[PDB]
Design a protein around this motif. Sequence first.
Motif, PDB file in Angstrom:
ATOM      1  N   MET A  73       0.863  -1.051  -0.087  1.00  0.00           N
ATOM      2  CA  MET A  73       0.063   0.094  -0.090  1.00  0.00           C
ATOM      3  C   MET A  73       0.942   1.350  -0.073  1.00  0.00           C
ATOM      4  SD  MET A  73      -3.630  -0.012   2.348  1.00  0.00           S
ATOM      5  CE  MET A  73      -4.100   1.559   1.713  1.00  0.00           C
ATOM      6  N   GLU A  87       2.687   1.663  -3.419  1.00  0.00           N
ATOM      7  CA  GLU A  87       1.661   2.025  -4.253  1.00  0.00           C
ATOM      8  C   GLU A  87       1.163   3.638  -4.268  1.00  0.00           C
ATOM      9  OE1 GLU A  87      -2.322   3.108  -5.326  1.00  0.00           O
ATOM     10  OE2 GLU A  87      -2.129   1.673  -3.645  1.00  0.00           O
ATOM     11  N   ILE A  88       1.209   4.092  -3.285  1.00  0.00           N
ATOM     12  CA  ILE A  88       1.154   5.472  -2.737  1.00  0.00           C
ATOM     13  C   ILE A  88       2.446   6.102  -3.422  1.00  0.00           C
ATOM     14  CG2 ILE A  88       1.174   7.155  -1.191  1.00  0.00           C
ATOM     15  CD1 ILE A  88      -0.845   5.217   0.437  1.00  0.00           C
ATOM     16  N   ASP A 133       2.446   6.466  -7.615  1.00  0.00           N
ATOM     17  CA  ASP A 133       1.801   7.775  -8.326  1.00  0.00           C
ATOM     18  C   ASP A 133       1.933   8.929  -7.636  1.00  0.00           C
ATOM     19  OD1 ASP A 133       0.164   6.753  -6.322  1.00  0.00           O
ATOM     20  OD2 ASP A 133      -1.441   6.463  -7.573  1.00  0.00           O
ATOM     21  N   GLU A 134       3.437   9.370  -7.528  1.00  0.00           N
ATOM     22  CA  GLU A 134       3.546  10.671  -7.053  1.00  0.00           C
ATOM     23  C   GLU A 134       3.770  11.995  -8.091  1.00  0.00           C
ATOM     24  OE1 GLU A 134       3.853  11.174  -3.584  1.00  0.00           O
ATOM     25  OE2 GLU A 134       3.722  12.934  -4.719  1.00  0.00           O
TER      26      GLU A 134
END
Lengths: 306, 335, 335, 98, 108
Positions: free
Chosen positions: E98, E101-102, E105-106
């Motif tokens: 998690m 995965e955060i 997509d920065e």
Amino acid sequence: VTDPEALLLLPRLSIQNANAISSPLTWGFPSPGAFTGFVHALQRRVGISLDIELDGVGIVCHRFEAQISQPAGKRTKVFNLTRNPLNRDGSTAAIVEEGRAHLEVSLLLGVHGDGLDDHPAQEIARQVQEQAGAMRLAGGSILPWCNERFPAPNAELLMLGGSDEQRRKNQRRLTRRLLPGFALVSREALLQQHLETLRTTLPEATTLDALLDLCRINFEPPWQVRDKPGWLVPIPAGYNALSPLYLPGEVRNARDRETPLRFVENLFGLGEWLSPHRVAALSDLLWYHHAEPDKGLYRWSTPRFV
Amino acid sequence: ILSTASVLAFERKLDPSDALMSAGAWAQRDASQEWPAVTVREKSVRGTISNRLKTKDRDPAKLDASIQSPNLQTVDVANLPSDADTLKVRFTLRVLGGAGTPSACNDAAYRDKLLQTVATYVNDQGFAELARRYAHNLANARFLWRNRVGAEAVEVRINHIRQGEVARAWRFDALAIGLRDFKADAELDALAELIASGLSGSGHVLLEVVAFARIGDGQEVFPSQELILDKGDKKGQKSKTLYSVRDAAAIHSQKIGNALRTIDTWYPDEDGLGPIAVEPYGSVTSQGKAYRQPKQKLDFYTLLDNWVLRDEAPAVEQQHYVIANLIRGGVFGEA
Amino acid sequence: ILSTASVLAFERKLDPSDALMSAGAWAQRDASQEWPAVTVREKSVRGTISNRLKTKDRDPAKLDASIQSPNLQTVDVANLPSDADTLKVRFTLRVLGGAGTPSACNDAAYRDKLLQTVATYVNDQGFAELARRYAHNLANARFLWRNRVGAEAVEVRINHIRQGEVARAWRFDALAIGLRDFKADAELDALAELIASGLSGSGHVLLEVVAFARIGDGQEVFPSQELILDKGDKKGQKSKTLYSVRDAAAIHSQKIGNALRTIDTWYPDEDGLGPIAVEPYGSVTSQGKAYRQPKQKLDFYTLLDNWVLRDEAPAVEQQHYVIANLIRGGVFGEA
Amino acid sequence: TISKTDIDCYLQTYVVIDPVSNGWQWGIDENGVGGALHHGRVEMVEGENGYFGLRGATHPTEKEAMAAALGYLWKCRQDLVAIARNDAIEAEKYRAKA
Amino acid sequence: AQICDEALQYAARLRELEPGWSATPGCQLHDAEQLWLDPLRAQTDETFLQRRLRGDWPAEVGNRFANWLNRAVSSDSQILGSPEAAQWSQELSKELTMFKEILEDERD
């Protein structure tokens, strides 16, 4: 209540003297009634012209500073006050202790209506921000961001996504934007089930005592402290009736003589400060009103949380 | 009644320095004052596990998975260069004198009785046995601890340093002089009378002890070892740190002092193991065993308390041991 | 009852030095004392991705976007010079002796019993099998690890260095002497008897082992590999650091020591793989598998605890292996 | 006439006794809640060589780690002692009242 | 989840410092974690440093975060041999999935 078609983001608003006294039992961050009343005043002042319905607010609180002080030899805190003007005879007035706090919140507003189509998104986002710049959020002035590096703009996110991956994508794009804070939600099911657990422990328990039990840090014998799931603050979750509903021109010294007055009293519920990427849908975590005025029970919460 | 003084701190006689190890070649030992120092350098070691398992880790799949992810370390290592077979370990030894006088003592009557007891020892038998054995532990290069265990030829040069230069120079064969027999000699008796006059206060004795060991080209020499910090990852572990004063390997001063003290052949256990270092509750760290345990009446404390408080003077061997502990120094005293 | 000691520290016998790599031309190996050293230099490598993908990275566009950004390293590289076809690897070897005596031991009775056990071994069958196998691992140049695997001609010269110089000179063909057969040879028996007299304590043995590997003009030689901090960026990553003692590429001392200990052809699995290094739970880190697992009764620890404690003396092969571990040294004992 | 152990009654909330595998290492909680997970501002300290843990010796029993904690608080940090003093005085006045 | 949460809040509140602080010259300054904690060097280095974090998508930081977080478990063989280590590694890798995965997509 009704689901938001779009999700407007007022960015980090600096409030300089907000009401730290949330309620007669709680201090700290101001009540969610302040923010829901602010968004209803935004609806009442700019939303009836853009043909939209600003309903529901999500509270984030990037920065908080209370004007408190810890006295010497004391464990607790007191409030730093202001020096009011004198009386007409020249004496100092009687001091009424108000708590002031410097906030930095960003609000997620649920926007639904037909004005989403008639206007651009950035236009109504700019209009509600230029109307919010002349307003106040818990009794404190909204500092309007002059001459820093860049002004924080808005973003009205249309919650209607063409795909679920795009919807998760721009929920992530908004959550990254309101990240250094902590979203404030309402956990009253947790309060009731903690009351049920405390009632299986000891009978005749009130949920004021269960709320306190979620507030304390309990020391347990074998020593260890009892852990908690989250932050779990006490919040005033609305009002409860004390008087029957009085007619508009019947009660004395009201605000207006065209609105029914009813003496009410706070209803302390449970909150939970959680980070905004623990919700996985920002169209939740928005605080609405629930009146049911025939019973009393004027209250705010965030339904559709879990 | 003469109870024991509550504090008794004795300063250390026989102060050595950090023994700087340098390198070079045999037959150029006489020009060994520009010899390049043995430098402590790093190298990366990797081993599989070799330690005993405690019956929970003897699963063969778990053992294979344990040797499939090995421990990677860096160690400080000191070797001779590949063109140098002689290790020169040089220190200076300062024999002070005034052994029985404490550096701190509360009970003044105890201090008078202890000074009278040590002066009675010196008048009956001065520091002649002790200096014979200290001169032996200089003469055989016991201060070379593991640099001596496989050396082809060890030679110790001891120089008594007067006003600025060598007043009298000794030169010994440290493998003929064994590590276990305190025999008699002609030059060891001269060095022993020198250290005897130093311990009595009859002169300033500053020795310069230089030892040369034929180890072999490139062989590992063994400076004294530090303790580690252990903050980061287990790959850049620094599993072994070695002592160095300034970019030059060195044995600690108290390791040299412990090897000089190894004079105690008088413990109640067997004489087949040799001398141990003079300690109260006379203990050797490698063997994990305290000889001169206080259950037998032969530690430093019951011997000193019988000698000073209630005049039970021990045998001449055990009082050699007691005065060797007073030369050693320490914090002797209750709370 | 004679339980095993909680500490057992055996010092390493057969101490080698860091094996310094130099370079030059064959047929002037007799004049190979001024051969220039092999220098560890830096060069920059660039690769594609060639490791296995884990079924989430196997997309075509993602694989092309991964090979569009090639990784850049700077490796340390040691090569022969372009006019030198021979790698000289020169180390020294001190065969020490006194194998059964531990440097540290808690239990005195266990130490005396283990000393009587090792003395029984040496009296019945002295260090003659082990020294023959160590003489082999000098004679076949197994200490040349990958520098041997494609060599045209390897020749090992072993000199017994007495008081200042060569007492006895050897000259072996390291390719005729295999890496898996411990045969019998007239010169290998002389070297076996010398290493025997070193291991028995009967004499001082220091060998100068030199090995000339005909690799080729300009080829890559393979010194020992350090471990990298990895504190910097990912283009000057320095993925490979090679060992050198002073601008002169070198094999680690413990890598030469691991290649000398490759004498164990008595492990319970197949001997078609040949000898492995003498380790407790006798393991090869190339193969990820511990032979002599403690589920079978053939590790060093159960063999020693049956030989010394409860006096079940194993076969002559497994007790050769136990005494080879005692020669190898280590931290035996529990916590 | 407020005794020392009644001041220790409210001073013990300022300490934290963390369990290590060797023993019990005491520490100081600056927020006065025994090192709680959320409301606990524990005092961490910088030592000699990369030491970032609780100020406190690893004692064998909790009875001695807590005693060394209380002794440190009584010797050095007298502001938390004044906090516990006023807490003990208010508790004595409360039992005089209710 | 709370530890990876405070990691994300630490990276988020660190963006108020200055747009360039990894541009300050050094040698050892965590050059793989500096792709994460300072995204505003892309506003200054328009092609130099912007394209080196959008194509790489620097998200191997979660593995180093797991190597740091496995210093919280005690070095006990009874904890290692049992199913507690497998269950711990499972949910630890889940929350690290998690968190990574955060961090993936920065760039939106």
